[PDB]
Amino acid sequence: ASLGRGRGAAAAILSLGNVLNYLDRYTVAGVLLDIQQHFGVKDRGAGLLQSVFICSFMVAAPIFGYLGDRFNRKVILSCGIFFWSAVTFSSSFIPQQYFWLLVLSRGLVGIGEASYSTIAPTIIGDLFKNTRTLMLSVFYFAIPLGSGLGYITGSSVKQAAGDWHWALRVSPVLGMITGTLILILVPATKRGHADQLGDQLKARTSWLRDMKALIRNRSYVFSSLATSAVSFATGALGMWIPLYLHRAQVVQKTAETCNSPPCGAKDSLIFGAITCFTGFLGVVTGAGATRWCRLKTQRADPLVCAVGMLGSAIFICLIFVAAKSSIVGAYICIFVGETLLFSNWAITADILMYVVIPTRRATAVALQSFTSHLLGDAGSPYLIGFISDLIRQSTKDSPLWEFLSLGYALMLCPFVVVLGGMFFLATALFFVSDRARAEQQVNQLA
Ligand SMILES: CCCCCCCCCCCCC/C=C/[C@@H](O)[C@@H](N)COP(=O)(O)O
């Protein structure tokens, strides 16, 4: 029959788990300045944490997908929850003379994180058409809320407690509880995946050969490159914006220097507020623009993406010169650029599913993702830190020069955003032809 409360309890528990996952992910970028001051490292060391975390997630995701494909799922999910909760809790006890060890800790988290985002969504697909679409929408909309909460709790715990260590100790406790219910309240153990009807295999393919066709898809390649550029920009900005804002506030002499008060606390909370509102706002505006423009021409999605990218690049270029005088203009530019940047999220997946044939579709959702991390946020924070260090090395160490060097280094992101917009325009050039070829192939194969 139909399980009464299980299909709702599982969805709610997994949504809470995803929120906690992203909160754990961003709680270390929330308080980066305190880590920098305590461990005595420069910008390169600051970016190394996020770079290592993203690299570990990159490596770990396909292996955990493979493991969850055939082995048990709920035990793997609970083990991952417990593992990164324990690692995060233990990472707060490291002294100030073993900074490298802390970096290693992030890598371990980067493993456990990959055990969730690759396995948690598919369980939803087991349990639910319209209901499945609504659940999946809620599950994916849990992301910006999680990032915002990560920022707010990090900053607020740093302010109230007076020590950044606590910011890494209250997050995983909720994990220790959460996984427990995932082990006792998730209905069933493993269902579905019974596509091998008749015998033990019906359609195994060969992975590589179909991949050989994927390079021949110009629209798919260009869209993947544009997604990689977007990931680069988002990772760099999300890692480095709060520190930039704090330095801009300290050079202008609004508040005192760090460690006399609880340093920068309102900026991170405010930034969490904008990102929390902006995830939803950007998704809504992108969907509405696509819906309106679909009835006027067949190239609505990539042209809309390109226009949004150009606008986001313009506003991201504007904020850097606007932040010198006042901060309200900087926040307004953050808002506008945030919406214009995240307007493309759903449209990217829509065009991906709309171009490539269903049979290879799953493979694309893997490969692109890997590329979306390979040229994106794998080394973007490290690159920004390295450029900032190189600029500051040939100049005297002053707060104003620190802020100016960070701004000049961050100026790289709008160039990449413009490149992504150009790539989306290239996608729009060939989208119709690729769609026609895919339609002909899928119709004539039957
Ligand atoms: C201007 C300030 C910007 C600061 C924003 C940082 C806040 C982070 C919120 C978003 C959290 C990560 C979003 C994930 C993006 C990638 O996974 C997708 N674009 C790639 O997957 P695919 O495209 O294939 O679906």
Residue numbers in the entry: 95 to 222, 420 to 737
Which sentences from the paper describe this structure?
Due to the amphipathic property, S1P cannot diffuse freely but has to be transported across the cell membrane through active transport. Among these transporters, Spns2 is the first identified and the most extensively studied. Human Spns2 is a classical MFS member with twelve transmembrane (TM) helices and a molecular weight of ~58 kDa, which is small for cryo-EM analysis. Here, we reported two cryo-electron microscopy (EM) structures of human Spns2 in inward-open conformations bound to S1P or inhibitor 16d.
We determined the structure of the Spns2fusion construct at an overall resolution of 3.60 Å using cryo-EM. Notably, Spns2fusion was mainly expressed in the plasma membrane and maintained a similar S1P transport activity as the wild-type (WT) Spns2. Notably, an elongated extra density in the central cavity extends into the C-terminal domain (CTD). This density could accommodate one S1P molecule well. The affinity selection mass spectrometry results confirmed that endogenous S1P bound to Spns2fusion. The phosphoryl group of S1P forms extensive polar interactions with Spns2, specifically residues Q463 and S464 on TM11, and the amino group of S1P interacts with S326 on TM7. Compared to WT Spns2, the double and triple mutants of S326, Q463, and S464, as well as alanine substitutions of Y246 and I429, substantially decreased S1P transport activity, but other residues showed less effect. Intriguingly, several positively charged residues, including R227, R456, R119, and R200 are located around the cavity but at some distance from the S1P binding site, which may participate in S1P recognition and translocation during the dynamic transport process. Residues D118, R119, R200, and E207 form a hydrogen-bond network to stabilize the local conformation of NTD.
